[PDB]
Protein: hdeb
Amino acid sequence: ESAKDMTCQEFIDLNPKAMTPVAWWMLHEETVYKGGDTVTLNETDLTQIPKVIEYCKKNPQKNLYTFKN
Amino acid sequence: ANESAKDMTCQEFIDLNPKAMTPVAWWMLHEETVYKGGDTVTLNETDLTQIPKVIEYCKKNPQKNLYTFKN
Structure:
């Protein structure tokens, strides 16, 4: 029941108010934080999160975390 | 307007895909705070104790907003 177990279909079906935190976590957990003094969205997220959504629409059966491959 | 992560109600939180609860709670607890983690972004022991308290808070107060946990 971890985020790494979430499918792309589950991701695109999330309450919209959950999609940004979930996408952020997938993109950033277990990576170096490069975003500055405070935790915030940054331009990388502006460009990547829409790509995650599109990737998951095209590949709903794949796990969300396969975006990183 | 009413569609942002900051606007999530406690009822919405307890109704989430269970796989989303930890990332949503983490973001609520950490967004806009000073980053005090190590080299990489990981859960810490404060998250271990606080995230269950977030779940309990929203179960007890479904009418309140998630982000009011911080108050």
